[PDB]
DNA sequence: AAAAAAAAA
C-alpha cells in the first residue's frame, strides 16, 4: 500500500510550544492576549503573527537548557499545517468578551442559536470551528537585521524574481517582487456550505477546500434516514459561510530580465481582509505561500504529472511612492513658508525643471 | 536480476580506477557545505564522464552504453549514487532537504563516431541509441514544475507515508503507468493531508531544434526535432543559438496501435531525452599568453590601422569604412543617470551608393565576424512580426509572445539590406526602437516593455539608378529626414572611372579568383565534409603561431588573423570602461564650433546630436587602445573621421 | 492572431 518513513518532526511538542509562546510572550502585558481580547469584543478582524517575535523568544529562552528544536525553520519548510495548528490553538484559548456587543445584528449566530434551542431542547451537532471563526490568520516575514543579531542563517525574505522561483520552492514561504498589471474584481467564495433539510431536524453541513465542489443528494436526518424520503435537501445561502476572493498576476521588472528573454508571469490569490490592498501599476514585494494547483480544471486528460502553481498572499508592502492628494501636514507647511521667504519663485522653478537642456 | 549488481560493481571498479571524478565529488560536496552556513550559487549534483577512458578500460560496457543505454545508464547512476552516499559525511543533516535522493545523473563527452548525427539523418535504425544532435534552437516552451513523490501525513498514526510517481518521459525504462490520484485515505481509514514542503517537484521544459540551413540538400527545407530536458540545464540558451545536445533517442506512446486509430496510416512518436547541452559557436576563453600578446600588440603605435586593415582583406579601398566598422563593433560605453534617464551607447552606420560597390559583401563580412548578429532584408520582412508575435502554445493552450528579429539581437548588431526598398509602414518599427532602444507591445491583453539595445547597420541605393553628384543630397535619398538624423555617420560611395584604379582593382580581383583550398587539387569542385571528430571539445608564449597573423607575405605592414581579433574585441568590450578628461573636451568643443560655423556646402546638416556622436566615438577610440582615460589624439582622430564622412578628405 | 490575393476608390 503506502510505505512509511521517519521524520525528525513531531507536532505535539511544537503545538505545546506554540501554546506556551502565545500565552507567555512579553514584548500592556502580553501582546497576544490583548489582540485576542480585542478579537473577542468583535473589534479586530485579522491576526498577524511576527516570526521575529518567535525567533527572539526562542533565542532568549535558549539561555536555559530546556528548548530542543527550532520552530521558525519548520514554518519556513511548511506553512499551511502551522496555520491550522495556530487557528486550533487560538480557538482553544479564546478569551471572554470584556465589552458589550450589539448581539442582534449577528444573523449567523441568531440562526445557530435557533438551531441549538431546537436540538438541545430535545437533548445537537458539533459545528466545525471554521464556521464559527470570525478572524483571519496572516504571517509576517522576518527582518534581515534580526537575522544579523544572531549567528544563525534564518534569512527568508530575499525577494526572488518570478523566473528565479523554481520547482523545489513549493510549500515554503517566499517573497516576490514585481509590478502589478492586472487586478480582478471582488467575488465571494464559499468556505462552509450548508444545506437546509426541510424541517428534518439538524441541517447537514459540508466543507470543501478544492476549487471544484459537489452537492449532496440525500441527508442523514433520522426521519429522512427512514425507509422513505422526507423532503429534498436544499442549499441555504444565509446559513453558509463566505469569504472574499480576488486573483491577480505580477510581472517581472525590466531590470531583472536577462538579455534576450521575455518576462514571465505569476498568478496570485488573496483572501480575507487583505482584499483590495493592491492596484495595477505599482512596485510591491508580496510575502506568501507558494502552492500547487491541479491541472484537472482544464480537463484534457493530459499532463499526467504536470501541474500549475500559484502564490497565496499573506502580507504586502505597497512601496513605490504616494501622491497623498497634497494632504496638509506641518512639514510641508514650513516648506511653503520657506518658499514664501524665497521671494520670486517662478524663475527658480523654470530653472529647476530641466537643467540638462540649456 | 544479478546483472544489475554486476554492472554496478563494474562501474564501481571503473570509478576506483580513475581518481578525477572522486576529487570532483569531494570538491562539489565541500563547496556546497561551505555555501550552506557561511556569511547564492549552488552546484547541481551532476558530473561529466569522458567515455574515451571507459573505452580504454572496458569495451563491453562502453558498447553497452552506446548501443542500449536503457539497461546500462541506470546501473551506472546507481553506482555513482552509492559512491556518493559512502563518500559524504554529514552527521547532522536537515529534515526536508535530506529526502531529495538525487540520483546524480551523468553527462558525456568524447568521440562518438557514427552516432554524431543531424536532424535529417535520424531514422528508425537509430532508435533506442545514445546520440548527439547538432542544430539551431528555433523555439522553447515554458518552465512548468511536475510532481514525482508526494508525502502524506495522518494525525492519528504519526507515520509519514510517501508515494512515488513515474511517467513515460521521466525514466529511460518503461514501467507500469501511475495516475496522479492523490491518496487521501489510509488502509484503516485515517485521513491523510498532503504535506507540501516535503514532496518532490522538478522543472520541465520542451525545446525544438532544427538542422542548419547551410548544410541542406538542394531544393529542400530544413527539418526539426524536439528535445525534452528537465531538472538541471532547464533554462539554458535561447531561440537562435547553436547547440549540440547529447541524449537518448527513444519512441513513446501507443501511436494508434490501440483502438483509437481512425486510419491504418498511423506513425508513432519519436522524442529525444537530453542528457547534456553544449554551445557550438561554429573557443570563447582567453589564455595567459593571449593576454601577453594582446598587451604587447596594444603597446604598438599603429594598432588602429593594423586592425582596420585586418577587416576583409579581399575588399579594395573603403579604408575609413573599415575603421568605422571597427569602432562600431566595440563602440562606446552606455551612460545612465538617476535624473537624465538614458543615454545611447553604440554607433549606427548607413551607406548609400551606386550599384556594385561592395556594400552587401562588407555587410556579410560584418555578419560573419560579429559575436552576435542577425541577417535581415527589407522586402522579406514585416514590422509587426519583426519585433513580437502572438502565438498559442500546443501544450498549455495559452498564447505567449515570441521574440522578433531584433529582440533576439539584443546587445548585438542588426544588418539590413534593401533598406530603402522596405515598405514605409514597417519603418515605424525602427522609428520606435532606435529612438529609445525599447519596444512596447500591447495586443490581445499583453502589456510588456521589451528591451532591445541593438545597433543597426543599413545599406540602401539612391532613388536614381546611379548617384547624381550635381543634385541635392536630400533628393537623392528616398528615406525621410527623421530617421536619417538618427544615424551617426552617412557614407556615399561612387565608382569613378579611372584607368589607374581600374587596372589596380582588376589585378586585385583577378588575384582573388586564382585561389586554391589547401591540400586540394584544382581539377575537381569543392566537396562537403563531416563534423569534427570530437562531439565535445575543450610551450606558452614562445610559439606566436597564430599571434603575428602574417600568414602570407605580400606587404611590409603586419596583418592579424580573424580569431585573434575576435579575442581582442571580446577582451576590450569587458575589461575596459574608459573615462574622458578636459583635454579631449577642449578639442571636441573647438572642432564642433569650427565645423558648425565654417559656412560652406556639406552633405548633411549638423546639430547637437553630432557632438554626442563625437563623444561616443572618442570613448570608442579610448577603448580601442586599451586605456582607462581619453587622450586628445582620440578626439583628433574622431574629428578627422567625421570630417571625411561629412566633407570628404 | 498573422500572411497574402483581389476589386474598387
Ligand atoms: N573594392 C572591391 N574589392 C573587391 N571586390 C569588389 C570591390 N567592389 C566591388 N566588388 C565586387 O562587386 C561585386 C558585387 O557584389 P555586391 O552585390 O555584394 O555589391 P554591392 O555594392 O553591395 O551591390 P548592390 O548595391 O547591388 O547590393 C562582388 O562580387 C564584389 O566582389
Ligand atoms: Mg551588392
Ligand atoms: Zn428532510
Ligand 1: residue of B353, B358, B363, B512 to mutate (most ligand atoms within 8 A of CB) is B358
**Pairing between β-strand A265-271 and β-strand A308-317 as defined by DSSP bridges:** parallel
CA A137 to chain CA centroid, nearest Å:
5
Do the chains contact at A305 and B146, CB–CB below 8 Å? Answer: yes
Q: How far is CA B312 from CA A222, B316, B415, in A?
A: 96, 9, 17
Residue spans of beta strands (DSSP E) within A106-216: 137-140, 173-183, 187-196, 205-207
Cell numbers representing residue A313 in the block: 498572499
3-class SS of residue B432: helix
Kindly determine whether residue A172 and residue B167, on different chains, have CB atoms separated by under 8 Å. no
**Which H/E stretch holds residue A75?**
helix A72-77
For the record, the C-alpha cell of B381 comes out as 520582412
Q: Which triple of cell numbers denotes residue A233?
A: 435537501
Q: Using N-to-C axis directions, what is the helix angle for B2-17 and B73-87, rounded to 10°?
A: 60
**Taking every pair of C-alpha atoms in chain A, what is the biggest distance, in angstroms?**
95
- CA gap A30, B380 in Å, rounded: 74
- Three-state SS for A10-46 is CHHHHHHHHHHHHHHCCCCCCHHHHHHHHHHCCCCCC
The protein residue with its alpha carbon nearest to ligand 1, atom 4, reads B315
**Nearest by CB: B410 against A7, A260, A263:** A260
Angle subtended at Cα B602 by Cα B599 and Cα B604, rounded to the nearest 5 degrees: 120
Residue nearest to atom 30 of ligand 1 (CA): B358
CA A161 from centroid of its chain's CA atoms: 21
Rg (CA), chain A: 26
| CB–CB contact B204 A5 (8 Å) | no
Q: Is B358 in the pocket of ligand 1 (CB under 6 A)?
A: yes
Neighbouring residues of the ion ligand 2, judged by CB less than 5 Å: B 360
Q: How many whole angstroms separate alpha carbon B552 and alpha carbon B298?
A: 22
In the reported structure, the alpha carbon of residue B362 is separated from the centroid of ligand 1 by a whole-number distance in angstroms of 8
- Per the CB < 8 Å rule, is B202 touching A167? yes
d(C-alpha B452, C-alpha B434), whole Å: 9
Ligand 1 pocket test: pick from B317, B361, B418, B420 the residue with the most ligand atoms within 8 Å of its Cβ. B361
CB pairs under 8 A between A and B: 120
The C-alpha atoms of residue A288 and residue A267 are separated, in whole angstroms, by: 12
Cα B358 to ligand 1 centroid, rounded to whole Å: 3
A positions 264-283 inside 8 Å of B (CB): 264
CB contact under 8 A, A260 and B202: no
Which residue, A225, A70, A75, A207, is CA-closest to A142? A75
Place of cell 544615424: B487
CA nearest ligand 1 atom 6, residue? B358
Q: Which residues of B touch A8 (CB under 8 A)?
A: 95
- Distance, in angstroms, between A1 CA and closest chain B CA? 8
Contact A5 B199 (CB under 8 A): no
Q: Nearest nucleotide (C1') to the CA of residue B390?
A: C1
Q: Whose C1' is closest to the CA of B383: which nucleotide?
A: C2
Extract the runs of DSSP E, i.e. beta strands, from chain A. Answer: 4-5, 47-50, 137-140, 173-183, 187-196, 205-207, 234-235, 241-251, 265-271, 283-293, 308-317
Is A255 an interface residue toward B (CB < 8 Å)? no
Pick from A168, A173, A300 the residue to mutate for testing the B interface (most B CBs within 10 Å).
Answer: A168
Ligand approaching nearest to the C-alpha of B321: 1
Chain center to CA of B25? 30
C-alpha cell at B539: 610551450
Q: Cα(B638)–Cα(B624) distance, rounded to whole angstroms?
A: 12
Q: Which residues of A touch B187 (CB under 8 A)?
A: 1-2
CA-to-C1' span, B448 to C7 (A)? 39
Smallest-distance ligand from the CA of A203: 3
Enumerate residues 6+ apart whose C-beta is below 8 A from B591. B614, B635, B639
Atom of ligand 1 lying closest to residue B495 CA:
8
Measured from the CA of B493, which atom of ligand 1 is nearest?
21
Half-sphere exposure of B552 (CA within 13 A, CB side): 3
Helix, strand or coil, per DSSP, at residue A274: helix
φ/ψ region of B21 (left if φ > 0, alpha if ψ in -120 to 50, else beta) reads alpha
- Which among A7, A163, A264 is the nearest to B160, CB-wise? A7
B/e letters for A319-337, b = 16+ CB within 10 Å, e = fewer, are eeeeeeeeeeeeeeeeeee
Amino acid at each position: 500500500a503506502l510505505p512509511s518513513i521517519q521524520l525528525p518532526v513531531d507536532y505535539n511538542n511544537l503545538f505545546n510550544e506554540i501554546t506556551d509562546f502565545l500565552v507567555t510572550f512579553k514584548q500592556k502585558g502580553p501582546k497576544y492576549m490583548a489582540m485576542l481580547q480585542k478579537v473577542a469584543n468583535r473589534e479586530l478582524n485579522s491576526v498577524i503573527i511576527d516570526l521575529d517575535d518567535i525567533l527572539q523568544y526562542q533565542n532568549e529562552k535558549f539561555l536555559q537548557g530546556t528548548q530542543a528544536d527550532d520552530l521558525v525553520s519548520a514554518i519556513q519548510q511548511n506553512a499551511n499545517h502551522f496555520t491550522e495548528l495556530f487557528c486550533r490553538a487560538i480557538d482553544n484559548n479564546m478569551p471572554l468578551p470584556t465589552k458589550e456587543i450589539d448581539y442582534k445584528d449577528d444573523v449567523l449566530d441568531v440562526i445557530l442559536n435557533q438551531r441549538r434551542l431546537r436540538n438541545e431542547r430535545m437533548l445537537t451537532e458539533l459545528f466545525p470551528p471554521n464556521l464559527t471563526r470570525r478572524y483571519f490568520l496572516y504571517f509576517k516575514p522576518l527582518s534581515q537585521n534580526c537575522a544579523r543579531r544572531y549567528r544563525k542563517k534564518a534569512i527568508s525574505s530575499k525577494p526572488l524574481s518570478v523566473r528565479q522561483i523554481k520547482g523545489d520552492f513549493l510549500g515554503q514561504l517566499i517573497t516576490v517582487r514585481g509590478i502589478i498589471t492586472r487586478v480582478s474584481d471582488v467575488k465571494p467564495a464559499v468556505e462552509v456550505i450548508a444545506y437546509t433539510c426541510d424541517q428534518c431536524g439538524y441541517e447537514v453541513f459540508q466543507e470543501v477546500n478544492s476549487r471544484t465542489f459537489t452537492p449532496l443528494s440525500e441527508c442523514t436526518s433520522e426521519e429522512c434516514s427512514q425507509n422513505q424520503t422526507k423532503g429534498q435537501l436544499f442549499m441555504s445561502t444565509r446559513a453558509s459561510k463566505f469569504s472574499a476572493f480576488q486573483e491577480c498576476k505580477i510581472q517581472e521588472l525590466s531590470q531583472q530580465v536577462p538579455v534576450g528573454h521575455i518576462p514571465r508571469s505569476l498568478n496570485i490569490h488573496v483572501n480575507g481582509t487583505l482584499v483590495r490592498s493592491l492596484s495595477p501599476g505599482d512596485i510591491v514585494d508580496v510575502t506568501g505561500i507558494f502552492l500547487p494547483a491541479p491541472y484537472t480544471g482544464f480537463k484534457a486528460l493530459k499532463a499526467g504529472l504536470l501541474t500549475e502553481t500559484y502564490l497565496e498572499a499573506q502580507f504586502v508592502r505597497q512601496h513605490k511612492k504616494k501622491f497623498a492628494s497634497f494632504s496638509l501636514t506641518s512639514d510641508v507647511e514650513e516648506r511653503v513658508m520657506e518658499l514664501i521667504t524665497s521671494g520670486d519663485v517662478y524663475n527658480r522653478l523654470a530653472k529647476s525643471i530641466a537643467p540638462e537642456i540649456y | 536480476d544479478a546483472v544489475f549488481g554486476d554492472r554496478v560493481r563494474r562501474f564501481q571498479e571503473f570509478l576506483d580506477t580513475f581518481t578525477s571524478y572522486r576529487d570532483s565529488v569531494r570538491s562539489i560536496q565541500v563547496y556546497n557545505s561551505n555555501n550552506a552556513a557561511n556569511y547564492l550559487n549552488i552546484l547541481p549534483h551532476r558530473i561529466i564522464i569522458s567515455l574515451d577512458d571507459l573505452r580504454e578500460f572496458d569495451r563491453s560496457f562502453w558498447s553497452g552504453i552506446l548501443v542500449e543505454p536503457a539497461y546500462f545508464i541506470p546501473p551506472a547512476e546507481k553506482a555513482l549514487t552509492d559512491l556518493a552516499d559512502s563518500m559524504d559525511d554529514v552527521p547532522h543533516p536537515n529534515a526536508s532537504a535530506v529526502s531529495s535522493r538525487h540520483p546524480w545523473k551523468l553527462s558525456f563527452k568524447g568521440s562518438f563516431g557514427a552516432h554524431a548525427l543531424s536532424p535529417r539523418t535520424l531514422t528508425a535504425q537509430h532508435l533506442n541509441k545514445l546520440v548527439s544532435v547538432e542544430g539551431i534552437v528555433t523555439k522553447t516552451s515554458l518552465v512548468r514544475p511536475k510532481l514525482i513523490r508526494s508525502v502524506h501525513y495522518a494525525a492519528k498514526t504519526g507515520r509519514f507515508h510517501y508515494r512515488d510517481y513515474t511517467d513515460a518521459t521521466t525514466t529511460l525504462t518503461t514501467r507500469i503507468p501511475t495516475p496522479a490520484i492523490y491518496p487521501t485515505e489510509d488502509t484503516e481509514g485515517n485521513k491523510l493531508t498532503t504535506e507540501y514542503g516535503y514532496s518532490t517537484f522538478i522543472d520541465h521544459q520542451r525545446i525544438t531544434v532544427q538542422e542548419m540551413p547551410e548544410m541542406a540538400p538542394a531544393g529542400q527545407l530544413p527539418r526539426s526535432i524536439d528535445v525534452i530536458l528537465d531538472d538541471d540545464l532547464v533554462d539554458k540558451t535561447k531561440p537562435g543559438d547553436r547547440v549540440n545536445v547529447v541524449g537518448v533517442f527513444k519512441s513513446l506512446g501507443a501511436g494508434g496501435m490501440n483502438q483509437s486509430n481512425s486510419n491504418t496510416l498511423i506513425g508513432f512518436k519519436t522524442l529525444i531525452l537530453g542528457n547534456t547541452v553544449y554551445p557550438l559557436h561554429a573557443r570563447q576563453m582567453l589564455t595567459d599568453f593571449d593576454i601577453r600578446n594582446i598587451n604587447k600588440l596594444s603597446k604598438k603605435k599603429d594598432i588602429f590601422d593594423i586592425l582596420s586593415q585586418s577587416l576583409a582583406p579581399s575588399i579594395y579601398g573603403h579604408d575609413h569604412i573599415k575603421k568605422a566598422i571597427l569602432l562600431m563593433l566595440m563602440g562606446g560605453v552606455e551612460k545612465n543617470l538617476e535624473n537624465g534617464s538614458h543615454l545611447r551607447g553604440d554607433i549606427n552606420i548607413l551607406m548609400v551608393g551606386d550599384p556594385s560597390t561592395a556594400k552587401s559583401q562588407l555587410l556579410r563580412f560584418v555578419l560573419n565576424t560579429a559575436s552576435l548578429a542577425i541577417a535581415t532584408t527589407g522586402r522579406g520582412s514585416s514590422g509587426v512580426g519583426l519585433t513580437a508575435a502572438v502565438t498559442t502554445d500546443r501544450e498549455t493552450g495559452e498564447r505567449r509572445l515570441e521574440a522578433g528579429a531584433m529582440v533576439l539581437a539584443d546587445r548585438g548588431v542588426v544588418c539590413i539590406d534593401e533598406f530603402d526598398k522596405m515598405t514605409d509602414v514597417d519603418r515605424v518599427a525602427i522609428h520606435e526602437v532606435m529612438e529609445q532602444q525599447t519596444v512596447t507591445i500591447a495586443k490581445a491583453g499583453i502589456h510588456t516593455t521589451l528591451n532591445a539595445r541593438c545597433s543597426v547597420i543599413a545599406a540602401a541605393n539612391p532613388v536614381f539608378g546611379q548617384y547624381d553628384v550635381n543634385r541635392d543630397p536630400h533628393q537623392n535619398i528616398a528615406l525621410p529626414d527623421s530617421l536619417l538624423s538618427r544615424f551617426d555617420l552617412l557614407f556615399v560611395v561612387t565608382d569613378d572611372i579611372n584607368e589607374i584604379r581600374d587596372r589596380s582593382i582588376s589585378e586585385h580581383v583577378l588575384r582573388t579568383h586564382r585561389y586554391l583550398p589547401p591540400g586540394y587539387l584544382e581539377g575537381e569542385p569543392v566537396r562537403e565534409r563531416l563534423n569534427l571528430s570530437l562531439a565535445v571539445g575543450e610551450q606558452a608564449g614562445a610559439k606566436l603561431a597564430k599571434n603575428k597573423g602574417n600568414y602570407n607575405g605580400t606587404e611590409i605592414p603586419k596583418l592579424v588573423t580573424i580569431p585573434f581579433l575576435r579575442k581582442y574585441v571580446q577582451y576590450a568590450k569587458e575589461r575596459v570602461i574608459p573615462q574622458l578628461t578636459q583635454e579631449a573636451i577642449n578639442v571636441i568643443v573647438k572642432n564642433y564650433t569650427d565645423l558648425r560655423n565654417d559656412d560652406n556646402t556639406k552633405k548633411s546638416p549638423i546639430t547637437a546630436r553630432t557632438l554626442e556622436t563625437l563623444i561616443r566615438l572618442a570613448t570608442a577610440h579610448a577603448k580601442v587602445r586599451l586605456s582607462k582615460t581619453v587622450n586628445k589624439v582620440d578626439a583628433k582622430v574622431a574629428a578627422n573621421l567625421l570630417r571625411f564622412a561629412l566633407l570628404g578628405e
